Amino acid sequence: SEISRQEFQRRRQALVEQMQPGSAALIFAAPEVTRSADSEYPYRQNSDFWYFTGFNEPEAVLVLIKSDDTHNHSVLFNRVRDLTAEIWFGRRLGQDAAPEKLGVDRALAFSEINQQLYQLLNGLDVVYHAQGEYAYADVIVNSALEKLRKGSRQNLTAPATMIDWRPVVHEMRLFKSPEEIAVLRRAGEITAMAHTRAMEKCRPGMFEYHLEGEIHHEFNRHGARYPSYNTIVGSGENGCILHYTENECEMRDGDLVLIDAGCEYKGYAGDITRTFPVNGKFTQAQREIYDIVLESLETSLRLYRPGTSILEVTGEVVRIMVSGLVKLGILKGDVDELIAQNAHRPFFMHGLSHWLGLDVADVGVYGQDRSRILEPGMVLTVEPGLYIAPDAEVPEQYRGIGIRIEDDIVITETGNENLTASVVKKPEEIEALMVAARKQ
Amino acid sequence: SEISRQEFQRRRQALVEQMQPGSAALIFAAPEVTRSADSEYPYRQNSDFWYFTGFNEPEAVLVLIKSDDTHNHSVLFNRVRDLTAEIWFGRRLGQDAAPEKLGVDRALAFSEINQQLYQLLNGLDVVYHAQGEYAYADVIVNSALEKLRKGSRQNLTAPATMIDWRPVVHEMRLFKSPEEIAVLRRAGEITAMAHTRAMEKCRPGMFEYHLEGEIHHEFNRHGARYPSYNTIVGSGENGCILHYTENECEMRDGDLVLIDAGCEYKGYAGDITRTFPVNGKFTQAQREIYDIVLESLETSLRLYRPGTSILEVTGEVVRIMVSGLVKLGILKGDVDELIAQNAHRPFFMHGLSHWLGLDVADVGVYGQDRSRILEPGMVLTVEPGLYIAPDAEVPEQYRGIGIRIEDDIVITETGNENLTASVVKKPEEIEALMVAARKQ
Amino acid sequence: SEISRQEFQRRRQALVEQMQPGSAALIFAAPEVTRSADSEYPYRQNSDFWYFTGFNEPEAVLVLIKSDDTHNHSVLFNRVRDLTAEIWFGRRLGQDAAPEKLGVDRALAFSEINQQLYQLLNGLDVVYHAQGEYAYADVIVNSALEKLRKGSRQNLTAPATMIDWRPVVHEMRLFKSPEEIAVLRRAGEITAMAHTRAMEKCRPGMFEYHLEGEIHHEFNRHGARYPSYNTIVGSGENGCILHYTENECEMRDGDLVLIDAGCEYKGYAGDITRTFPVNGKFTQAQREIYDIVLESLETSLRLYRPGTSILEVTGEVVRIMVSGLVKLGILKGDVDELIAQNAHRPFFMHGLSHWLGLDVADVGVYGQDRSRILEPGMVLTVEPGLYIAPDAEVPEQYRGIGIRIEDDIVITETGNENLTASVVKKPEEIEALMVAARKQ
Amino acid sequence: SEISRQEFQRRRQALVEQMQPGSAALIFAAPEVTRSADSEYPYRQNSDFWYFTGFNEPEAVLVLIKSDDTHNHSVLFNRVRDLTAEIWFGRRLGQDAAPEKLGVDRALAFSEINQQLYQLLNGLDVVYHAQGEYAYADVIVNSALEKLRKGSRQNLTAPATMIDWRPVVHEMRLFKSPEEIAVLRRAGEITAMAHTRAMEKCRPGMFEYHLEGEIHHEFNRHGARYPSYNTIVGSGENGCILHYTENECEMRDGDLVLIDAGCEYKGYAGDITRTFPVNGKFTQAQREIYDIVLESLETSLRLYRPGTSILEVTGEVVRIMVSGLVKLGILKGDVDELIAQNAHRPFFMHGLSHWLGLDVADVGVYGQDRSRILEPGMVLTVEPGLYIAPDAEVPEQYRGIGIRIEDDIVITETGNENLTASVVKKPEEIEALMVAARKQ
Ligand SMILES: [Cl-]
Ligand SMILES: [Cl-]
Ligand SMILES: [Cl-]
Ligand SMILES: [Cl-]
Ligand SMILES: [Mn+2]
Ligand SMILES: [Mn+2]
Ligand SMILES: [Mn+2]
Ligand SMILES: [Mn+2]
Ligand SMILES: [Mn+2]
Ligand SMILES: [Mn+2]
Ligand SMILES: [Mn+2]
Ligand SMILES: [Mn+2]
């Protein structure tokens, strides 16, 4: 599954529909990024630029011009064909091929942007620009507007109104099309296969980074070349560090390992966490904490639906956690009083859910305390966890246990669809999976 | 094999030995780099900063103070211990532990750099600073010097002389210690195992990116988490693109695939290229071009030694290439006249060799036209290639063939050591390797 | 005559009336400007900031908040009272006194602007800001908006719409109140007295700069401390240079001197040009050119009125000039054909008129080719000139003559009022004035 | 008196003598400075640039190249001849005329600086540059060095050492040539005539700014067009503000007026302060304070000589002040104890002396607490003062009195020459001067 030319075009048109007559929207590509000296990191297109183009080159700018309420057109600035540059560094789309390939009306060389952009903005009332997104982009836009402001003797005029299109565009991204959901479903499947593989491969004495290697190989074979974020493989005490990415330790017989990893497939993020015993068998202490996190996730998956909110579901999870921690003697006191005191926070210190899409921590307004009412088309994670620090003042057997279990869901008309349930999470299923692998 | 605390210390001392009395050298860490929105690329420390510290954190600055010809000391600025930041994002070395861990005299919080740096520079004659390396670093240094310049009423004075330490440090990096060579030897071995794996796994119908996946998994299992540069897997016509990294095509029965990939092991780069038939058997045309590139590499490996140069060895390769291309009818005319006209350049348009080390295209002065005389301790690649474009005016059977074969070598007292000869390159050996794999 | 607190307040209210509900307008003071090393030029407040405050301090920002269609208020950021800074550098208004003195609702310390500005913008829909006017201002505004954009977890929101208030404010400035016209009338009177003085003082052998000295002294004694622009005193060939400010030459018996000088009185510019003989008597050649420039000015003064334009009146002047130059043999051919060819342009190469106000070349839209229809309340100059270069291919006697004659006018309901007719311009009146002075 | 071409040349040569072989020094002109909108302040050349050129244009850069110990040459970048730009804005020196006019070897267009500067720096070991002096200059220099650093394949190399030439050049400026002293002597004479005029013109009811007008007119008539700093005319309580420049009050019968004003003559500053009664007669209270400041100045003028210091002479002044203030009951206690407590500081809170030259607060190292030993050729001010605030806890009659008396001196082989003694300062001489003027 992918996003096609006609969908990118529909998105451009939907933005144009929201724009004032006599305006232009400017969407800039990501800069290339140095890794060291003259070597660059693998290119990652800006999510918003990608959303409207599916075009994976730097030095590109999409300009949507809404001349009035019926007439609009698009102009792409992009790198020129250049035989020597292409022999060295790769093929370029160029100007001749872009209109047909991308479904834009006109294409111009990026090298000419300063000579041309002001001409496109001249006489417009409004420019939509994400000020501060990129320095290079602000320079180009500010230069164009200055030429227009200072150009009255050449009959030039600048648009006086600049509107940040990020809020409008991020609200578009928050609600996924069926095609987007299909892509996210595939990302979830790929990511789940990777996690299953990690559980089947994990043995005491392997290094945390070995599981990262297994996961990334699995992503790759299904055509998700890159992870959507830096893979976390936190064994033992390392699991208590939320974004542990050192992945440098030897995994010990008797420790849990917490894996938070997700692929990037056609631009879209998977995002799964599974925690499991390195040796294939939960200890009693590990199981006692695990059961509370799993109940939290299972209850959340029952509850998430249109008309509730992340805040409302979080309240249910907090009750589950406080209740469970009191039963184990990790917290002491009356459950309702402890809830009132947010007594869970030393052990569950992050949010239950974030939006998911072209960014793993995806764009879109959450509302105060993530109270926004959920609607069909929203995609989000569900990621309860409990982290008991090595020096926590709790019964000894729980110290140094970090557990998180995370699925990706889409809100539907009656509830939700779990995109990542194809990798096991019930403790008996984890143990059976690992037992079977360990016998081979 | 690795580089240890005492070696990092020896390097700092060797720099101090080269510094003027009454001076300070400032070496800054790399910034963290955005991949998309709030996600960052995996951190890569600045090579020069790494060379003197082995410290893999951002927000760090090494200050070497040479008070006079006998007295010197070191100060590290680095991130403070912070329980909440560490729970979220990972452990920090902090100030208490740094002197012992890194072998520096003092450690101070990076948050205090603007309050402290000017005090360390006050009254010195010379500051060594790599101006323009990083914007954030220039801001810090320029601010410190301004405070000193403007501080005469507070009895402050700025060093009037600023010296770029890059030339001195890059000349240090150009000559590897035995420990560095051991690390590079291991990088070469790891990288060679990865290339052997790619040849053994390659089958028609696999995608170029699948071989990338095999290679990166192999790097990872030996503890080289990341490649030293973006992997190139160019099959068919894609092999004619020097830094082809799209790796997006289905590999065809009858095409060659050119793989240029290298690991990063303890900071140091491997860098191997092998080209081989996708179906395990070179065609006659493919073999005819391959033989010329291989002879070029083999002759270069015989020749490279102290007292010759990249330029001198390149002349021998050019003769081999022109001679071979005339024999096949790709070039026409007298060999010596064609050499005089650089007639090989449409087909071999890049350099034979680059330095290798903490950067894949490593630092160090080459001399005019890479004429610098070679000495023991230099490490370099040997990477002849021939690329016959799909539209070249040559006998048809050669069109769309791109072949490069690259090894990594170290110059020794009598010649060179090949660090990457453990992956085959003779065509009969490539075919035997692939035949054996294809029968499994 | 001056502009008073209540008028500054009316202007602020008139801007607020034009603003969208749920918005804030930000108007920043001018930076102080270095002359050399640690010495600064005399402070000149930003015209727009002045227009809304009458406040002559740097490090000040006026914030007009329109909460909704009935509720609005003003906040001034300005320098705090500071006993030591004031002993050294001058008194400051401070926060306690500002509301009463300036008629603003609240005053806050400029040192707190970054801690406070984002709080004032939070939750607004629109911010009015003159982007690019000052770097320091853009930094402050961009920082505030970034804090808001990134502050969703603190329940902060940024206004998505930024509107340049310059067009609205400059249209306000283009139409003068009666009080403004009174101030401009006084500026015109002061400037005219200065020009009369220069004619009465001028003698052969004096330097051009001596007349500058006379003029500036005259400005000063009437309470116009500073000129509104750099005084031009161009004698002989120097008169052919439009903005000649070197003023370095000895004025020669037989040359004309062209003086373009104007005071700045309560922020408002006078702008007069008079040209006259250094020795008090026009030569025939000088008079022949002078008569054409004077007829051009006199006809323009008859014509300027509501309903015509600078472009229309310029056409009449061009005819006068071409006709006169043909009569003298400076141009050759048919007058209407020469007009069609813009044959006057080598000799009259600038505009007839510019707006006049808080800037000498005042703000406001002219329309294409200065075609905007004139209306009561506009204030403008009328400045025909003819400049015959020393090497012009014209009858010899005219070479090196530069003449400009300029008055300041206000458009009224039936025509115009000349603000600067109290300094003579008829050649017989100039000669009588100078003869009388030369006899003393 | 002036500074001539051959002296500017001698200075360039003296700098070259101090430079390392294989180096270039870069000295940049001042930017033009906006006053308001499209009007600029009168141009003031950068003092250091002026010191080496006597060239009063912007967009100019002096490059001194010391190829080795015997061979050196100079290159000026400056604005090209341009007929239209010159007709509009003034004559330009251009490239053809510059070598002869300024005594430089070569001149190139400023528009070509980025194409040419790197070529001049290529292969040098050292560049002398005043980093941070001007943003535009840093941009040009940093760009040149980057091209060289990145240009190894074009056989380019950057100088690795950058030296701030300000310390060397400012030490040159600290010691005046006889020609410089002649110019400063004339500045002192002009400035003294201006102060005498102010005393002769001052009457109760005039505004502070009227005396500014008299002073500036006097500067102008002697060919010092501009003041060297913003004129201070502080009457009554305003005299207690050290750099009072509002000059806005009506001068009252019974108040003193303190005038601190100085001309700029051929680039060099005069700097005189005189305080005198507005009505021509000191009151007893005024005279009592005045006598202490005058004794302080007179004693300083006796003492200043080679081999003493500003710090040493300041100690003598402090004793005079404390002794006098005890006698009047303004201070109470033992003189030596009060001196030990710096009890004078509420009333004399600034330094006695600053260097004087191309800047009024001139360049040059003072040493700790201005302890540097004086030598012939140094030029400095002597400016004791006493300021008794309106709310000081002192006998009532002294409240609101601010007195400063300042002369400019040059250190000579036996003592000093007073450059400004031609304007009276003894109270009986001030009164006689004013009485005589008031009778006219
Ligand atoms: Cl391009
Ligand atoms: Cl820190
Ligand atoms: Cl403040
Ligand atoms: Cl130029
Ligand atoms: Mn997540
Ligand atoms: Mn996750
Ligand atoms: Mn290589
Ligand atoms: Mn390679
Ligand atoms: Mn004018
Ligand atoms: Mn004018
Ligand atoms: Mn002074
Ligand atoms: Mn002074």
mmCIF file of C-alpha atoms in Angstrom, chain A residues 22-151:
data_model
loop_
_atom_site.group_PDB
_atom_site.id
_atom_site.type_symbol
_atom_site.label_atom_id
_atom_site.label_comp_id
_atom_site.label_asym_id
_atom_site.label_seq_id
_atom_site.Cartn_x
_atom_site.Cartn_y
_atom_site.Cartn_z
ATOM 1 C CA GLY A 22 -5.468 36.195 -3.839
ATOM 2 C CA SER A 23 -2.946 34.094 -1.896
ATOM 3 C CA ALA A 24 -0.003 31.724 -2.226
ATOM 4 C CA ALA A 25 1.134 28.868 0.040
ATOM 5 C CA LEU A 26 4.875 28.060 0.192
ATOM 6 C CA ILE A 27 5.960 24.576 1.381
ATOM 7 C CA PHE A 28 9.713 23.949 1.545
ATOM 8 C CA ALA A 29 11.725 20.711 1.407
ATOM 9 C CA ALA A 30 14.060 19.627 4.217
ATOM 10 C CA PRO A 31 17.708 20.559 4.028
ATOM 11 C CA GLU A 32 20.288 17.807 3.653
ATOM 12 C CA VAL A 33 21.997 17.170 7.020
ATOM 13 C CA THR A 34 25.717 16.543 7.721
ATOM 14 C CA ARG A 35 26.612 13.409 9.660
ATOM 15 C CA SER A 36 30.378 14.015 9.713
ATOM 16 C CA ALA A 37 32.567 16.239 7.598
ATOM 17 C CA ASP A 38 31.563 15.646 3.949
ATOM 18 C CA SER A 39 29.183 12.723 4.629
ATOM 19 C CA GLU A 40 25.439 13.272 5.064
ATOM 20 C CA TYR A 41 22.737 11.362 6.880
ATOM 21 C CA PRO A 42 20.242 9.530 4.644
ATOM 22 C CA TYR A 43 17.825 12.173 3.413
ATOM 23 C CA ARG A 44 14.492 12.554 5.209
ATOM 24 C CA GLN A 45 11.963 14.769 3.471
ATOM 25 C CA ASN A 46 10.023 17.277 5.582
ATOM 26 C CA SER A 47 6.717 15.613 6.573
ATOM 27 C CA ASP A 48 4.504 18.478 5.451
ATOM 28 C CA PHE A 49 6.348 18.832 2.132
ATOM 29 C CA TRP A 50 6.045 15.050 1.668
ATOM 30 C CA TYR A 51 2.315 15.152 2.552
ATOM 31 C CA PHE A 52 1.654 17.422 -0.428
ATOM 32 C CA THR A 53 4.125 15.969 -2.996
ATOM 33 C CA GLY A 54 5.542 12.492 -2.339
ATOM 34 C CA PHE A 55 8.789 14.034 -3.693
ATOM 35 C CA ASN A 56 12.018 12.929 -1.983
ATOM 36 C CA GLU A 57 14.540 15.546 -3.167
ATOM 37 C CA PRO A 58 16.081 18.486 -1.346
ATOM 38 C CA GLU A 59 16.218 22.011 -2.865
ATOM 39 C CA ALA A 60 12.537 22.039 -3.721
ATOM 40 C CA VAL A 61 9.643 24.360 -2.919
ATOM 41 C CA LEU A 62 5.942 23.863 -3.681
ATOM 42 C CA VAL A 63 3.984 27.039 -4.400
ATOM 43 C CA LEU A 64 0.179 26.869 -4.495
ATOM 44 C CA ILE A 65 -1.334 30.021 -5.989
ATOM 45 C CA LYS A 66 -5.033 30.809 -5.455
ATOM 46 C CA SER A 67 -5.539 33.733 -7.797
ATOM 47 C CA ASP A 68 -9.242 34.033 -6.915
ATOM 48 C CA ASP A 69 -12.124 31.734 -5.857
ATOM 49 C CA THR A 70 -12.154 29.668 -9.091
ATOM 50 C CA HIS A 71 -8.603 29.938 -10.492
ATOM 51 C CA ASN A 72 -5.585 28.288 -8.885
ATOM 52 C CA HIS A 73 -2.385 26.607 -9.965
ATOM 53 C CA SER A 74 0.786 25.034 -8.658
ATOM 54 C CA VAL A 75 4.464 25.721 -9.291
ATOM 55 C CA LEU A 76 7.315 23.464 -8.144
ATOM 56 C CA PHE A 77 10.869 24.729 -7.781
ATOM 57 C CA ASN A 78 13.288 21.801 -7.927
ATOM 58 C CA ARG A 79 16.810 20.893 -8.943
ATOM 59 C CA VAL A 80 17.641 21.139 -12.658
ATOM 60 C CA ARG A 81 18.780 18.140 -14.729
ATOM 61 C CA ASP A 82 22.581 18.130 -14.623
ATOM 62 C CA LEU A 83 24.485 15.282 -16.248
ATOM 63 C CA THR A 84 27.624 15.584 -14.075
ATOM 64 C CA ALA A 85 25.769 16.049 -10.780
ATOM 65 C CA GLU A 86 23.543 13.064 -11.599
ATOM 66 C CA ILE A 87 26.468 10.775 -12.597
ATOM 67 C CA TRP A 88 27.992 11.598 -9.223
ATOM 68 C CA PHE A 89 25.072 11.777 -6.828
ATOM 69 C CA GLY A 90 21.883 10.378 -8.367
ATOM 70 C CA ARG A 91 19.093 11.067 -10.785
ATOM 71 C CA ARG A 92 17.010 14.236 -10.557
ATOM 72 C CA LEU A 93 13.436 14.678 -11.631
ATOM 73 C CA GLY A 94 14.134 18.040 -13.324
ATOM 74 C CA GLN A 95 11.611 20.505 -14.751
ATOM 75 C CA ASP A 96 10.420 18.776 -17.942
ATOM 76 C CA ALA A 97 9.166 15.616 -16.195
ATOM 77 C CA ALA A 98 7.829 17.145 -12.938
ATOM 78 C CA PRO A 99 4.416 18.386 -14.050
ATOM 79 C CA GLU A 100 3.360 14.905 -15.260
ATOM 80 C CA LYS A 101 5.123 12.940 -12.513
ATOM 81 C CA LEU A 102 3.862 14.997 -9.560
ATOM 82 C CA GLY A 103 0.672 16.493 -11.056
ATOM 83 C CA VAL A 104 1.755 20.135 -10.703
ATOM 84 C CA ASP A 105 1.092 22.771 -13.354
ATOM 85 C CA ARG A 106 4.607 24.200 -13.800
ATOM 86 C CA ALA A 107 8.156 23.441 -12.669
ATOM 87 C CA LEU A 108 11.080 25.901 -12.418
ATOM 88 C CA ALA A 109 14.724 25.501 -11.433
ATOM 89 C CA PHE A 110 15.461 25.967 -7.717
ATOM 90 C CA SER A 111 18.518 28.040 -8.761
ATOM 91 C CA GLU A 112 16.038 30.649 -10.067
ATOM 92 C CA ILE A 113 13.890 30.835 -6.923
ATOM 93 C CA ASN A 114 15.087 34.328 -5.920
ATOM 94 C CA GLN A 115 14.505 35.635 -9.456
ATOM 95 C CA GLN A 116 11.013 34.093 -9.649
ATOM 96 C CA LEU A 117 9.387 33.808 -6.210
ATOM 97 C CA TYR A 118 8.774 37.550 -5.761
ATOM 98 C CA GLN A 119 7.056 37.585 -9.195
ATOM 99 C CA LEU A 120 4.610 34.874 -8.014
ATOM 100 C CA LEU A 121 3.836 36.767 -4.768
ATOM 101 C CA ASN A 122 3.506 40.214 -6.404
ATOM 102 C CA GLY A 123 0.044 41.677 -5.909
ATOM 103 C CA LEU A 124 -1.266 38.883 -3.684
ATOM 104 C CA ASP A 125 -3.033 39.729 -0.405
ATOM 105 C CA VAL A 126 -1.879 36.743 1.702
ATOM 106 C CA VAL A 127 1.179 34.463 1.835
ATOM 107 C CA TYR A 128 0.968 31.188 3.776
ATOM 108 C CA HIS A 129 4.404 30.376 5.186
ATOM 109 C CA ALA A 130 5.637 28.328 8.128
ATOM 110 C CA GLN A 131 7.875 31.026 9.572
ATOM 111 C CA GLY A 132 10.759 29.608 11.577
ATOM 112 C CA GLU A 133 10.500 26.043 10.224
ATOM 113 C CA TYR A 134 13.787 26.412 8.311
ATOM 114 C CA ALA A 135 16.345 29.230 8.276
ATOM 115 C CA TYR A 136 17.021 28.793 4.541
ATOM 116 C CA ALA A 137 13.315 29.060 3.770
ATOM 117 C CA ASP A 138 12.839 32.191 5.901
ATOM 118 C CA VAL A 139 15.753 33.793 4.049
ATOM 119 C CA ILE A 140 14.125 33.092 0.655
ATOM 120 C CA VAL A 141 10.678 34.285 1.729
ATOM 121 C CA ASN A 142 11.946 37.387 3.565
ATOM 122 C CA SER A 143 14.075 38.346 0.535
ATOM 123 C CA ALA A 144 11.097 38.004 -1.825
ATOM 124 C CA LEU A 145 8.850 40.122 0.400
ATOM 125 C CA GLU A 146 11.570 42.775 0.800
ATOM 126 C CA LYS A 147 11.961 43.069 -2.977
ATOM 127 C CA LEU A 148 8.205 43.559 -3.275
ATOM 128 C CA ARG A 149 7.986 46.056 -0.390
ATOM 129 C CA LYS A 150 10.864 48.116 -1.834
ATOM 130 C CA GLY A 151 9.637 47.742 -5.456
#
